[PDB]
Structure formats: structure tokens, C-alpha cells
Amino acid sequence: RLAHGVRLKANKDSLYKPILRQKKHFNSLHIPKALQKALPFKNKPKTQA
Amino acid sequence: KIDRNPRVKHREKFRRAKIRRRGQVREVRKEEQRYSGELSGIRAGVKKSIKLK
Amino acid sequence: MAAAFRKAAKSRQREHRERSQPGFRKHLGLLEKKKDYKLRADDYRKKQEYLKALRKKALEKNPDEFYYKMTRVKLQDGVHIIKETKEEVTPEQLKLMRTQDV
Amino acid sequence: KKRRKERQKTAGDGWFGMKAPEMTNELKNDLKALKMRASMDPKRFYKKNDRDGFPKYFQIGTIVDNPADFYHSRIPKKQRKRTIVEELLADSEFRRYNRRKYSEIMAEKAANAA
RNA sequence: GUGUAACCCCAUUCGU
RNA sequence: AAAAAAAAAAAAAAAAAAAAAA
């Protein structure tokens, strides 16, 4: 490479770079309307309007 | 670099040993300024006397 | 001198580095690794275990069960909503609030 | 029953009959401020609070001037205020520090929220 | 079926 | 722990208030 004019070219993909990840959030659990009716009174989820 | 000289290693261990002691027991200080408060709270619930029986 | 062998080997502390997403697929998002997928995998497992716990409870549900909360509360589409209590103002106080407002 | 009610209105004979003051939004604002005195100054640390709730018997006042302490310990009459809350509003040192911390918490929360 | 409706119905035109 | 409801505040946070799992 020194005798000729060839120069090293490094692939941009292969190099190592900082990732900089961000916190990931998830949906809350959705219970079907049919299941809430089917559930017993003790285990029925009770909320406010 | 601290491990290179044993004397300054022992010097540094003593400085920490005084700091770690400050949690257990209080250091004596003189009234170098007029008393202006405790600089912290005054806890009236702790009873730190030693019972004799 | 087993520990002496270990100390010499760990003299170099350069740790293996992570690879990033290829450029031509950058708009898709971050290349997920085992540490990231494990967050998504444990999230699913918790919800599916909870629904299976709930669906089992519906099996032994007794339709004739009775509780004294049931008398004053009515289901709405199957959901047990606790309706807000009424204030029950009377005309004299209702006239009083308007005089205060003006 | 009625004699119990009369005895609970005062601290008692042991403390020369302190009376429980009526609770107001200005006194309550003062008590909340004192309970959170730990975060006022980053270079000052305090012991834990004695009680979780507010004290039942307490009185409020100001410290009397002493002639010998003209320069050592005395606030000029313009800087004096009526309440502990207004004192916190006045000094630049506390406002500058508190604003910087509160801005940080919102910004870090914004990174978490997005 | 929570992982960051056609079919049918009325009416219009065409035409072995 | 968590899904809610009621207030204030800052450019979301904060105090109380219920249900459900454990």
C-alpha cells in the first residue's frame, strides 16, 4: 500500500459508536368488558367515574 | 501511586479513620463563637443515657 | 497462587464494545440486544400470567353471590363503577352561594 | 367528658398552660416550610424530624434585640419580615439554589417521560 | 380478536 | 406494587383518596 497509492477506507457501519438508548414505556393492561362482568365480586376491579 | 510510599499510605489511612469514627462518637469543640444554636435539630425523643443496675 | 494468576490476566480492563444499527436501516430504530429484549419479554410474561389468574377465577364464580354493596351500586356494561356521591344542596344554601358569588 | 375537653385545650400545668393556636393557612404554610428545612441549603444537614405530624401546642414569636450584638448578630429592620415563608422569598441565596435544582428535576423527568 | 360487514332490501336501465 | 378520581403548581410535577394483586 505504501509503494502504490492505495489508502485504507474504513466502513462506517463497522466502526463503534455510542448507542444513546432511551427509556422504554409499555401500555397498561386492558381487561375485556366481558371478563370484568364474569369475575366474582371480591376480585372485580372497582374504580371511580 | 499511593501504594508507592508506605508512609503516605499510612497517613491516608489515619485521615479516613478519623472520618469513619465521626459517625460513632462526637468530637469535642470549644466555644470559639458565641452560642447561636445547635445548627441542627434538637431531638427530644432519644434517651442516650446508660442504665446502671 | 491461584489469585496471583487471576490478577495478572485482568491487568487489561478494555471490555468488548457494542455494535450499532446499520445506516441504511436507521429510520427503523435501535438494534435491540439481549438486555433490551428481556425488558419486553418479562413485560409480556407478567400480563399473561395475570389474565390466566383472572380467567381461572371466573370459572368458580357463583351467580347467586350476594354482597351488601350490590344493593346501592349497579354495573355499567359489566364494569363496577363507584358513582360519585351527591351534594344534596337545598334552595336556601343555593340562594346563598349566588349572593356570595356576585 | 366535659372535664376531659377542658384539659386537652391547654398543654397543662407542667408547661405553664400553653394554648393550642387555631390552625390557619398561614400557620400551616409555616409548619410545612420548617418540616422541609433539610433541602434549603445543600451545605447544611439536619437530623430527622421528631414527629411526623404537626405539633399540637406551639407559639410563634421573634427574637429580641441585644445591645451588645449590634454587629455580630442583628438583621437590619428593612430585611425583617412577618412570617418564615416571606423570609424564604426574600433571600437571593435560597432562591438561586432552589430554582436550579427544581429545573433539573423537571428536565430529567422529561427525558424519562418521552 | 390490546405485546411500545357482506349477503340481503327498495327503486333504474338493458336484453336472448 | 399497581389501574383510578378529586386539588393546586411548573414549562409536567406535587398532597391527599379509593379499589385490585401480593
Side-chain angles (χ1 to χ4, degrees):
Chain A
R1 287 205 215 99
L2 269 296
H4 308 135
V6 175
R7 294 277 305 97
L8 285 173
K9 183 44 62 191
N11 295 117
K12 278 78 175 176
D13 294 359
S14 297
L15 305 168
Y16 294 96
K17 294 180 285 292
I19 309 297
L20 183 63
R21 45 174 44 89
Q22 153 176 30
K23 184 182 284 188
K24 193 68 166 302
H25 302 275
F26 301 104
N27 300 344
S28 68
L29 172 73
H30 181 74
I31 313 186
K33 299 294 178 68
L35 187 52
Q36 307 195 27
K37 168 195 271 292
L39 281 181
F41 182 76
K42 194 182 132 153
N43 312 137
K44 263 170 179 161
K46 306 173 188 55
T47 56
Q48 297 203 11
Chain B
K1 188 190 173 223
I2 295 93
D3 287 331
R4 188 169 68 187
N5 189 359
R7 177 178 61 71
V8 299
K9 187 176 182 180
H10 282 293
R11 172 166 198 217
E12 190 276 331
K13 272 156 157 212
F14 192 49
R15 188 184 66 82
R16 293 294 299 165
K18 288 170 70 176
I19 296 165
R20 309 214 319 282
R21 176 174 166 83
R22 282 221 271 273
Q24 294 179 357
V25 65
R26 303 281 79 77
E27 181 139 30
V28 176
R29 50 158 198 283
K30 294 262 171 303
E31 184 178 1
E32 61 86 20
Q33 297 299 322
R34 269 192 197 132
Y35 178 85
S36 76
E38 182 65 26
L39 291 178
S40 298
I42 299 170
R43 292 210 53 177
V46 292
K47 301 190 287 289
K48 295 188 290 293
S49 75
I50 294 170
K51 316 292 221 214
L52 307 173
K53 59 173 67 66
Chain C
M1 311 205 188
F5 277 95
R6 207 190 327 294
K7 291 189 65 174
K10 301 182 173 186
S11 67
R12 184 185 64 86
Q13 289 285 305
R14 278 79 176 273
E15 65 190 6
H16 293 107
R17 288 216 270 174
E18 184 178 0
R19 292 176 62 187
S20 66
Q21 180 77 222
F24 79 100
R25 297 167 35 97
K26 192 80 75 184
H27 59 287
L28 294 192
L30 311 190
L31 206 48
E32 285 182 350
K33 304 313 154 69
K34 205 104 187 173
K35 64 176 71 175
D36 193 324
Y37 154 70
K38 183 56 66 175
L39 295 167
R40 194 169 30 101
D42 295 316
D43 183 70
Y44 202 53
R45 186 175 292 275
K46 291 189 184 297
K47 291 158 177 245
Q48 291 324 291
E49 282 183 312
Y50 191 43
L51 287 197
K52 186 176 179 180
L54 283 190
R55 287 193 195 100
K56 288 193 286 185
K57 298 302 289 183
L59 267 287
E60 68 271 12
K61 194 261 186 180
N62 195 0
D64 301 304
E65 87 183 337
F66 174 71
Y67 293 83
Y68 277 117
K69 276 294 191 311
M70 301 165 118
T71 74
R72 282 179 175 178
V73 186
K74 180 189 302 179
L75 283 178
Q76 286 172 28
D77 283 350
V79 193
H80 185 106
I81 299 98
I82 315 178
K83 36 193 181 284
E84 292 185 353
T85 183
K86 185 61 68 178
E87 314 304 313
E88 211 180 0
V89 298
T90 78
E92 298 83 25
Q93 298 109 350
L94 189 48
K95 206 170 189 61
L96 187 43
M97 311 195 148
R98 291 143 193 281
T99 61
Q100 280 153 358
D101 291 331
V102 296
Chain D
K1 180 63 71 61
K2 78 172 51 64
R3 276 151 46 183
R4 284 161 200 160
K5 301 287 99 175
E6 287 293 332
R7 293 229 321 280
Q8 307 304 353
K9 187 175 287 293
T10 197
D13 189 359
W15 291 277
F16 307 102
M18 221 176 278
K19 293 186 288 184
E22 58 206 0
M23 212 55 208
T24 52
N25 296 113
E26 293 81 3
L27 284 186
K28 185 182 284 186
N29 269 0
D30 291 331
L31 304 198
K32 296 205 281 222
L34 274 169
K35 282 206 156 313
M36 294 182 286
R37 74 199 168 174
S39 45
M40 309 273 199
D41 206 353
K43 294 177 174 64
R44 279 269 302 268
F45 318 103
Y46 297 88
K47 285 187 262 197
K48 286 163 187 125
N49 297 133
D50 290 332
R51 59 178 64 86
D52 49 291
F54 299 149
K56 182 160 296 181
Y57 312 95
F58 62 95
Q59 287 179 351
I60 62 170
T62 59
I63 295 170
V64 176
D65 291 331
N66 285 139
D69 291 331
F70 187 80
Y71 307 98
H72 153 63
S73 176
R74 183 200 64 113
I75 290 177
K77 290 183 67 174
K78 293 182 183 293
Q79 279 82 50
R80 288 171 210 211
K81 303 296 183 182
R82 254 191 321 271
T83 43
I84 315 169
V85 177
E86 292 176 355
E87 298 179 346
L88 298 173
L89 190 67
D91 55 353
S92 296
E93 181 67 27
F94 161 72
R95 300 292 299 278
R96 190 198 325 290
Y97 165 70
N98 179 37
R99 174 263 288 271
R100 178 185 56 85
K101 298 298 293 295
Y102 177 67
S103 304
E104 282 163 27
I105 315 297
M106 301 325 268
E108 301 325 324
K109 215 71 64 181
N112 290 318

